[PDB]
Amino acid sequence: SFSGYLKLTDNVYIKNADIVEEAKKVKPTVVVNAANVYLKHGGGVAGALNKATNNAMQVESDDYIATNGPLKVGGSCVLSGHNLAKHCLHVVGPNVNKGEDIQLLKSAYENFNQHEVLLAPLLSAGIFGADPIHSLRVCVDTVRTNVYLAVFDKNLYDKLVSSF
């Protein structure tokens, strides 16, 4: 059901789209969230996905943290996708604006290999502060399963495709 995506490799596809609108249209098995270790979904992709769930994502996330403690940078957990997908894979890429190690970006993308197909944002890009051209290269060199990337910023999408 994914449509209008540009094929970058055998398994990586990309589109200039709002991941919330894409998830509402496709209802994928898995939507990836650009999470932090506390699952505090304030801004960026996380804030937008949580708002689309009417805060149900944050209520579920707070119960998960109260039981399990925080995730590791480079780690993930599978929770409900609520009204957006069957599941949400919350993945923690390093936040360069918080001083985190960019070398953990490959470990973050490895979580995608546990799922046959995913709708996802570009990890550690945007307000997480990493070079998005680097994030796209690590994605295509790490993920082996079928990944549909939704890039919100139009200017960024154009820059990523022309430089790929």
Ligand X SMILES: O=C(O)C[C@@H](NC(=O)c1ncnc2[nH]ccc12)c1ccc(F)cc1
Taking the least distance from each CB to ligand X, the nearer of 63 and 83 is: 83
Please name the residue ranges forming H helices in the chain: 19-26, 44-52, 56-68, 105-110, 132-142, 154-163
CB of 130 to ligand X, least distance (A): 8
25/63 with CB nearer ligand X? 25
Residues that bind ligand X (CB under 6 A): 18-20, 34, 44-45, 48, 93, 121-128, 150-153, 156
User: Quick check: 112 and 32 in contact, CB under 8 A?
Assistant: yes
Closer Cβ to ligand X, 79 or 135, answer by number: 135
CA 157 to each of CA 2, 61, 76, 110, 153: distance values in angstroms, whole numbers, following the listed order: 17, 30, 26, 23, 6
Residue in the shown chain whose Cβ atom is closest to ligand X = 126
What is the nearest approach in angstroms of ligand X to the Cβ of residue 36? 9
